[PDB]
């Protein structure tokens, strides 16, 4: 009958008809083949126990993050620089730039900032790494912000202290387009990073700069802040998030996530910390946006609802599906599925040429 985990309740990556089976035993060596178990702790745990558990989600994290970019030959003929800016709280916030060797003129800017729930994973990790030298390999000038996160070794500053580093880090490189050698700015990011993308687009516009961005590109984007709702809630507003709960993320632990982020949760309903909440106000006037969902993936839902409200806003929106994929697949499986990377890749590089200033 109906599809994932609506249909069969215990269906899990491995046992889902429409998972891209590549990915499936790319995921086997870490148990990720299978629905993780029900999270240990619950968003009511006290806030030290939280971000104890943060920590170790990410430590375990980069390590499978690090084994799947291992094996691969180097992205070739990328120039990279680290800079290292002051933020609004007196922090460090370091930009790591990449760009094609021997660029004879500007290329199409982009602005990537990192997912992990606003919470954990550094953008000095080999999977952004990767995924900005494909960017850059393209013909673009790539730009990885390294913001402060909720949680882990980069933690722990709740919201929104991380969107506050965004804001600060892309003026400081629209500032700078002509000696970065950029052309058109594009602000880009998955998950969580697809989160800080959008929100950086709504907070742009309310702070008169909009200048600083040409277009948006927010992958598998992380914004609902729903994930803590009770099964039959979760649904009837986004069924992905029933569908496909346990798909590599988990709701439970996301709904952990939610609360390290913005302890009280006062921002819940604040579109700034969940874009999905955005009113018409705040998204008319935004410049270009692309939306990319994965079929598979239990964020798919919040996804399609904000291109829908992109449209009803009328800004100049595109959305797409990655067949097969679970949340981020087209990241993460640059080894076991390079077609599904490559399009991902390809797409954005499609969208940065298309923008004009
Ligand atoms: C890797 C990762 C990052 C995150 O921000 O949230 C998660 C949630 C999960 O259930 C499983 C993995 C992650």
Not at 146 to 170: K, Q, S, T, W
Not at 212 to 220: E, F, N, P, R, S
Not at 251 to 265: K, R
Request: some cysteine; aromatic content about 8%; overall charge negative.
């Amino acid at each position: 009958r109906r599809p994932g985990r609506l249909g069969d309740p215990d269906r899990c990556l491995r046992t889902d008809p429409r998972t891209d089976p590549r990915t499936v035993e790319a995921l086997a060596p870490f148990g990720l083949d299978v629905n993780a178990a029900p999270a240990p702790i619950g968003p009511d745990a006290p806030r030290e126990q939280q971000l104890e558990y943060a920590m170790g989600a990410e430590a375990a994290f980069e390590g499978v993050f690090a084994a799947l970019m291992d094996g691969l030959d180097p992205v070739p003929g990328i120039e990279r620089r680290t800079e290292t800016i002051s933020g609004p709280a007196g922090n460090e916030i370091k930009l790591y730039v990449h760009r094609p060797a021997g660029a004879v003129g500007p290329l199409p800017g982009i602005f990537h900032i990192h997912g992990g729930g606003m919470v954990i994973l550094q953008a000095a990790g080999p999977v952004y790494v990767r995924f900005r030298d494909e960017l850059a390999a393209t013909g673009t000038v790539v730009v990885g912000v390294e913001y402060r996160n909720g949680a882990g070794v980069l933690g722990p500053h709740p919201f929104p202290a991380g969107l506050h580093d965004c804001a600060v880090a892309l003026d400081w490189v629209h500032a700078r387009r002509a000696e970065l050698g950029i052309s058109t700015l594009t602000v880009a990011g998955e998950s969580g990073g697809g989160n800080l993308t959008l929100a950086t687009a709504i907070r742009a516009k309310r702070e008169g700069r909009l200048d600083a961005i040409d277009g948006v590109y927010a992958l598998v984007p992380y914004i609902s802040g729903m994930y803590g709702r009770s099964r039959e809630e979760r649904e009837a507003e986004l069924p992905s998030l029933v569908e496909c709960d346990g798909y590599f993320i988990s709701c439970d632990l996301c709904a952990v996530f939610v609360e390290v982020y913005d302890p009280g949760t006062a921002h819940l309903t604040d579109p700034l910390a969940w874009p999905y909440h955005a009113a018409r106000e705040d998204l008319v006037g935004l410049p270009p946006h692309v939306i990319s969902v994965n079929e598979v993936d239990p964020l798919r839902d919040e996804g399609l609802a904000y291109y829908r409200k992109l449209v009803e806003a009328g800004v100049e929106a595109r959305s797409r599906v990655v067949p097969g994929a679970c949340h981020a697949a087209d990241m993460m499986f640059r080894k076991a599925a390079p077609d599904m990377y490559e399009a991902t890749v390809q797409d954005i590089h499609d969208f940065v040429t298309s923008l004009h200033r």
